[PDB]
From Swiss-Prot:
Parent-protein start and end of this portion: 176 to 328 of 1101
Domain CBM-cenC: 37-143
Phylogenetic placement of the source organism: Bacteria, Bacillati, Actinomycetota, Actinomycetes, Micrococcales
Family of this protein: Belongs to the glycosyl hydrolase 9 (cellulase E) family.
Function comment: The biological conversion of cellulose to glucose generally requires three types of hydrolytic enzymes: (1) Endoglucanases which cut internal beta-1,4-glucosidic bonds; (2) Exocellobiohydrolases that cut the disaccharide cellobiose from the non-reducing end of the cellulose polymer chain; (3) Beta-1,4-glucosidases which hydrolyze the cellobiose and other short cello-oligosaccharides to glucose.
UniProt organism field: Cellulomonas fimi (strain ATCC 484 / DSM 20113 / JCM 1341 / CCUG 24087 / LMG 16345 / NBRC 15513 / NCIMB 8980 / NCTC 7547 / NRS-133)
Name by which UniProt lists this protein: Endoglucanase C
Name of the coding gene: cenC
Source species, domain of life: Bacteria
């Protein structure tokens, strides 16, 4: 993992029993089976802005680099899309990407990016993070945990 004891920034990381205060819709009613939640994304929607998870709370200090450690795998294999930033106002985000490769590899993936825009929790623009997996080429996404850290020494 990161440095001694990851630096969980948000007090929540257990999608095995409940999806905490996170959101989820657009795909198949997710289901936390044994200890993980999966969503059927085989349909065929050529537009990620359709199914995915969502949640606020993800401060960003323009200048430093953050990291997202999501626990999940793609079945079959294929790339997905993820975005993170504020939720109102500038709207422009820095965690806006669409090249996230995922296959039968279950584990925590760490995505490190450079903060280019400060994003505080107060200002009609709190934390924002929407996992975009919807895709005419999508498939199935099984997640059991999700949390972002920073790792400092």
């Amino acid at each position: 993992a990161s440095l001694d004891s990851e630096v969980e920034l948000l007090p929540h990381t257990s999608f095995a029993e409940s999806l905490g205060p996170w959101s989820l819709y657009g795909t198949s009613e997710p289901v936390f089976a044994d200890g993980r939640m999966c969503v059927d994304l085989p349909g065929g929607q050529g537009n990620p802005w359709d199914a995915g998870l969502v949640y606020n709370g993800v401060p960003v200090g323009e200048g430093e680099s953050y990291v997202l450690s999501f626990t999940a795998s793609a079945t079959p294999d294929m790339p997905v899309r993820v975005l993170v930033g504020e939720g109102g106002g500038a709207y422009r985000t820095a965690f806006e990407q669409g090249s996230a490769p995922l296959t039968g590899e279950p584990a925590t993936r760490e995505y490190a990016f450079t903060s280019n825009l400060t994003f505080p929790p107060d200002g009609d623009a709190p934390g924002q993070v929407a996992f975009h997996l919807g895709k005419a080429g999508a498939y199935e996404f099984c997640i059991s945990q999700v949390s972002l850290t920073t790792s400092a020494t």
